[PDB]
Amino acid sequence: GSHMEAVQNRIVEAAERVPGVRGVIHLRARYVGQDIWAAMIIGVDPENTVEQAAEICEAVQAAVCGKIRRIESLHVSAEAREI
Amino acid sequence: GSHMEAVQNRIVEAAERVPGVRGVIHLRARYVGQDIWAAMIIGVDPENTVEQAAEICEAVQAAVCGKIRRIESLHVSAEAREI
């Protein structure tokens, strides 16, 4: 913690910058040693296709893991969300 | 178990009969006392909208809980799936 809060901040921020993300609805992050393992849910446009939602999830996973190096496991899922 | 396997059978079967379900991809079911609590993932058409996928999930939840009375908690989520 404290230092976790700073990491979580960077995860939320990294995710929100990815096209199609309507907020991070949920983020659970934990230290396994010096590595982070995490799970998040993002908001998506309810009219996107399931495919697009899966694409946005992958894109988040890559942007986030691309920016926070200590992350060794991130699962990203999606939920319909209004703006 | 044994009797769990019979319940799980009925959950899979109930789910597959619901329009838009492309198989049950995952089912975790457990006894809390004499009640079942469960979580499942269904296949959906990747071109459905996220909204439709959420609708199909609710419809599964209701059909299944409507048919297996001992179920007191069922969460249903969806994943893109090819036929």
Side-chain angles (χ1 to χ4, degrees):
Chain A
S2 233
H3 75 311
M4 176 62 96
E5 200 210 62
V7 175
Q8 285 185 292
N9 248 108
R10 290 166 58 198
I11 295 167
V12 166
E13 298 187 344
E16 290 187 345
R17 298 307 87 227
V18 171
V21 173
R22 305 187 160 177
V24 172
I25 290 165
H26 175 68
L27 174 63
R28 191 168 263 103
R30 294 300 156 44
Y31 273 113
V32 188
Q34 292 169 342
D35 296 336
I36 292 284
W37 291 26
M40 62 187 297
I41 304 174
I42 58 174
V44 294
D45 185 356
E47 310 295 320
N48 285 155
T49 67
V50 165
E51 252 303 298
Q52 293 171 304
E55 287 172 2
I56 301 162
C57 293
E58 278 301 322
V60 171
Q61 216 174 258
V64 175
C65 283
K67 278 167 167 205
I68 301 105
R69 267 42 100 166
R70 70 189 81 201
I71 295 183
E72 295 293 343
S73 178
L74 176 64
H75 298 126
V76 188
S77 74
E79 258 183 43
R81 208 55 39 132
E82 238 47 279
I83 28 67
Chain B
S2 233
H3 75 311
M4 176 62 96
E5 200 210 62
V7 175
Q8 285 185 292
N9 248 108
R10 290 166 58 198
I11 295 167
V12 166
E13 298 187 344
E16 290 187 345
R17 298 307 87 227
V18 171
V21 173
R22 305 187 160 177
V24 172
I25 290 165
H26 175 68
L27 174 63
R28 191 168 263 103
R30 294 300 156 44
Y31 273 113
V32 188
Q34 292 169 342
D35 296 336
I36 292 284
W37 291 26
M40 62 187 297
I41 304 174
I42 58 174
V44 294
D45 185 356
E47 310 295 320
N48 285 155
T49 67
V50 165
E51 252 303 298
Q52 293 171 304
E55 287 172 2
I56 301 162
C57 293
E58 278 301 322
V60 171
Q61 216 174 258
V64 175
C65 283
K67 278 167 167 205
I68 301 105
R69 267 42 100 166
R70 70 189 81 201
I71 295 183
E72 295 293 343
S73 178
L74 176 64
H75 298 126
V76 188
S77 74
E79 258 183 43
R81 208 55 39 132
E82 238 47 279
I83 28 67

